């Protein structure tokens, strides 16, 4: 938990130096806030967010979603084999010009 944060920090540093996101003057503090938002979710053994974790989080936001709807949400932001999405997946979505449904829900 607090351990997995170490990895999130390394990723934030990686993104901080990414020219693709340099135009955002508030990147330094935003990445930290996004990290905190990500850590509100239950993170699995690999530090990724799964279906039940997403379900739990959306419940807290008053946004109930069906099992299949949860699959659609993750499948939209996941860079791997649909089922879970990572922190890097999360940042590219939160940043990035395209607006995934999960991004609109969370922001
Ligand atoms: Ni889980």
42 labeled binding residue: yes
Residue 1's closest CA among 33, 44, 53?
Answer: 44
Q: How far is the CA of 24 from the centre of ligand 1 (A)?
A: 33
Residue 97: count of CB within 10 angstroms of its CB:
4
Q: How far is the CA of 41 from the centre of ligand 1 (A)?
A: 10
Q: 27-38 and 87-94 helices cross at what angle (nearest 10)? A: 130
- Cα gap 19→28, rounded to integer Å: 13
State the residue range of the domain holding 83: 1-107
84 labeled binding residue: yes
Resolution (A): 1.9
Strands (E), the chain: 49-50, 84-85
Q: How far is the CA of 64 from the centre of ligand 1 (A)?
A: 18
17 labeled binding residue: no
* Number of folded domains that form the chain: 1
């Amino acid at each position: 938990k607090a351990q997995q944060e170490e990895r999130l920090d390394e990723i934030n540093k990686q993104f901080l130096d990414d020219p693709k996101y340099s135009s955002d003057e508030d990147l330094p503090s935003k990445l930290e806030g996004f990290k905190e938002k990500y850590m509100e979710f239950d993170l699995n053994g690999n530090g990724d967010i799964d279906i039940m974790s997403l379900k739990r989080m959306l419940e807290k936001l008053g946004v109930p979603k069906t099992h299949l709807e949860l699959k659609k949400l993750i499948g939209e932001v996941s860079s791997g084999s649909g089922e879970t999405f990572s922190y890097p997946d999360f940042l590219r979505m939160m940043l990035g010009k395209r607006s995934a449904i999960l991004k609109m829900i969370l922001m």
